């Protein structure tokens, strides 16, 4: 079984300089890419960084300074420079897939406490009655072609992928998401909705440039019973 | 019969002044008094101010300067009188109930777009149990409120309602599986016997009857995974 987890968070006091650990098992870095991701409480996901499984790190350019990525041969290492009460979050590692750099395998995450393309969501929360239909929009600044990835976050649980390469569907993910757009629009519809399928769904930018990767601001999607 | 209705949300360019109306059916405004809450796209619910029956108004310390309360016999008013991008939000009139500066019966609220000192701490921020499982949110208060505790429910794009006042006592149509308790500083919501219906995200607020006391917690969105 391939899987990963993150390990280091704490409480902290601001300068505090704090690292973070990525431990993998079922794969080897050798032949996998790794990303961190954040997540403040409320708020939505945000990329910081890449490393190659050759070790070529880039970073997101307001992460520059703030963070340092390393790897062992099982190990991928964040660390956090200087932090502040804005870098309160929960930081999760992700394994990119083949393709894009989207991330097809999520840690639980670790909670860390301290005492330019853009991406537009719409809408920012909708319910709709069991056996609905749903429909998200995403809008890119710049044409992104087909790089763009759908994910479900449960509340206090860990992203899911459903969709990479626009319309492509993840293993396991039933029919009834259906991905499409190309370029600068993009939608994700959720055909006969159930109960399960309350989550917040994020697009992603999975342009291979830092500064194309993008996450969306979410959408709170519920169903009404 | 007993209902509440706000008007006037539109779009506005920054510092067009505006007047929202707030419009009741079913009880008189000699009776109840009314009070003002806004919650801005994905973000928290604020508390803007009230109005007694006796027309005695109370705002926010930040609110104050940038809003303006006011009441005919059918409708209460409320006025930005400078709006900037930071005003974009759904506003919500709300009937306070009785014994506390917490709110029964709430608006579908009005969305308004803007284009070109007690601290409420909710833990865990994000929560997912298992069908029949129990989950437990803490709200904890910076200064003594005593028992003024109120709990709400709200589903993704729709309106509050309240579960619980006076730390403890069941809000009408409730459900004995949601229990709250505490005292001063430290409450505490427990959802028994979950069920997808409870999906949703749970807010506490300070019911406490000044306006330098009145705060919301910053939510806990609870999933049934």
């Known amino acids: 079984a391939q899987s990963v987890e993150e390990s280091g968070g704490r409480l902290v006091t601001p300068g505090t300089p704090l690292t973070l650990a990525c431990?993998?098992?079922?794969?080897?870095?050798?032949?996998?890419?790794?990303?961190?991701v954040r997540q403040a409480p409320g708020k939505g996901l945000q990329w910081?960084?890449?490393?190659?499984?050759?070790?070529?790190?880039?970073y997101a350019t307001w992460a520059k300074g703030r963070f340092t990525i390393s790897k062992t041969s099982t190990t991928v290492d964040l660390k956090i420079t200087s932090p502040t009460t804005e870098d309160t979050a929960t930081?999760?590692?992700?394994?990119?897939?083949?393709?894009?750099?989207?991330?097809?395998?999520?840690?639980?995450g670790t909670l860390v406490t301290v005492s330019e393309l853009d991406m537009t969501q719409t809408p920012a929360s909708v319910s709709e009655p069991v056996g609905g239909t749903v429909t998200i929009k995403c809008?890119?600044?710049?044409?992104?072609?087909?790089?763009?990835?759908?994910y479900q976050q449960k509340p206090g649980q860990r992203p899911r992928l459903l969709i990479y390469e626009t319309s492509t569907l993840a293993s396991g993910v039933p029919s009834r998401f259906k991905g499409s757009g190309s370029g600068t629009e993009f939608t994700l519809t959720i055909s006969d909705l159930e109960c399960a399928d309350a989550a917040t769904?994020?697009?992603?930018?999975?342009?291979?440039?830092?500064?194309?990767?993008?996450?969306?601001?979410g959408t709170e999607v519920g169903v009404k019973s | 019969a007993q209902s509440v209705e706000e008007s006037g949300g539109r779009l506005v360019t920054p510092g067009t002044p505006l007047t929202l109306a707030c419009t009741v059916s079913?009880?008189?405004?000699?009776?109840?008094?009314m009070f003002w809450v806004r919650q801005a796209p994905g973000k928290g619910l604020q508390w803007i101010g009230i109005?007694?029956?006796?027309?005695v108004i109370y705002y926010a310390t930040w609110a104050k300067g940038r809003f303006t309360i006011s009441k005919t016999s059918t409708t209460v008013d409320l006025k930005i009188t400078s709006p900037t991008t930071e005003d974009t939000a759904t506003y919500f009139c709300?009937?306070?109930?009785?014994?506390?500066?917490?709110?029964?019966?709430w608006g579908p609220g009005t969305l308004v777009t803007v284009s070109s000192e007690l601290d409420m701490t909710q833990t865990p921020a994000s929560v997912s149990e298992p069908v029949g499982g129990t989950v437990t949110i803490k709200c904890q208060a910076s200064?003594?409120?005593?028992?003024?505790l109120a709990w709400y429910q709200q589903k993704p794009g729709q309106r509050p309602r309240l579960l619980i006042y006076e730390t403890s006592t069941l809000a009408s149509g409730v459900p004995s599986r949601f229990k709250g308790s505490g005292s001063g500083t430290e409450f505490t919501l427990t959802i028994s016997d979950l069920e997808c219906a409870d999906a949703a995200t749970y807010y506490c607020?300070?019911?406490?009857?000044?306006?330098?006391?009145?705060?919301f917690g910053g939510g806990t969105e609870v999933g049934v995974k």
């Open positions: 079913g009880f008189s405004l000699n009776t109840y008094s």
């Open positions: 709300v009937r306070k109930y009785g014994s506390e500066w917490g709110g029964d019966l």
């Open positions: 200064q003594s409120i005593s028992s003024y």
């Open positions: 607020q300070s019911t406490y009857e000044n306006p330098t006391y009145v705060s």
């Open positions: 109005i007694s029956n006796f027309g």
